[PDB]
Design a protein around this ligand. Structure first.
Ligand SMILES: CC1(C)Cc2cc(C(=O)O)sc2-c2ccccc21
Ligand SMILES: [Cl-]
Length: 253
């Protein structure tokens, strides 16, 4: 029994082909409703045969990697390249026991010393999110860099930067329609550009926005959380109705 697999390729990717890809990622993630915003499945009690989904990516050089996405928080937990599989360091032993059920066929299994969170990947990559280009070009380059890590051809700083690109255009593009729209604009005009402060702010606030929405009374927040306009200037929202077209998935709380 294999997990659900989603196929996307950067070779000739259009605005529509990438939209259908992200729309497919949201579908497999929200299989397990009534809420106006879909709520990701609960970690406790979730049987392992529905704990993950696989997102395989290819590029113009026909190089392929498969990313493993947890379904409770839509985060990449590891990836397989050829005959090897790589996993971030798990948070507890329950998650360490869950990851031995993916890629049960590879010959080489490795667990990194570090977690997959952004601030760690930015230290490893030697660059911040505001300095890492996003787009189809940066994604095609990442895919080649993920695989060639299995052959010793990619060093760790390039691998960490490649994770930052992939996590933003798959995981963050699923969570927020706003971020997916930002990626679709880069594909539309064939331009690579780093995320503006309105995007980093949403990525860091996903857990905090997931808090205020499920804990909202009639849709009103208890305390206002603050977002950023694209010019860096800040504001504050107080209810769910302004974020409905903005956020698509929420971790359970
Ligand atoms: C932060 C985010 C997602 C992005 C954004 C960027 C704006 C600008 O270009 O000034 S406004 C605005 C906005 C408004 C209402 C809810 C959410 C947002
Ligand atoms: Cl570490």
């Amino acid at each position: 029994k294999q997990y659900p697999i989603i196929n996307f390729t950067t070779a000739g990717a259009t605005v529509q082909s990438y939209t259908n890809f992200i729309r497919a990622v949201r579908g497999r993630l929200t299989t397990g409703v009534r809420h106006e915003i879909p709520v990701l499945p609960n970690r406790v009690g979730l049987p392992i045969n529905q704990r993950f989904i696989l997102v395989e990516l290819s590029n113009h050089a026909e190089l392929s990697v498969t990313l493993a996405l947890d379904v409770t928080n839509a985060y990449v937990v590891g990836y397989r390249a050829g005959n090897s599989a790589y996993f971030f360091h798990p948070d507890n032993q329950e998650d360490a026991e869950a990851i031995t059920h993916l890629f049960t066929d590879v010959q080489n299994r490795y667990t990194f010393a570090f977690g997959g969170n952004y601030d760690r990947l930015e230290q490893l990559a030697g660059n911040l999110r505001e300095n890492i280009e996003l787009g189809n070009g940066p994604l095609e380059e990442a895919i080649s860099a993920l695989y060639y890590y299995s052959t010793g051809g990619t060093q760790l700083p390039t691998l960490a930067r490649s994770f930052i690109i992939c996590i933003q255009m798959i995981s963050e593009a699923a969570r927020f329609q706003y971020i997916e729209g930002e990626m679709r604009t880069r594909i539309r005009y064939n331009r690579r550009s780093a995320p503006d402060p309105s995007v980093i702010t949403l990525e860091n606030s996903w857990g905090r926005l997931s808090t205020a929405i499920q804990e909202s009374n009639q849709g009103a927040f208890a305390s206002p959380i603050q977002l950023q306009r694209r010019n860096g200037s800040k504001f504050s929202v107080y209810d769910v109705s302004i974020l409905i077209p903005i956020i698509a998935l929420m971790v359970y709380r």
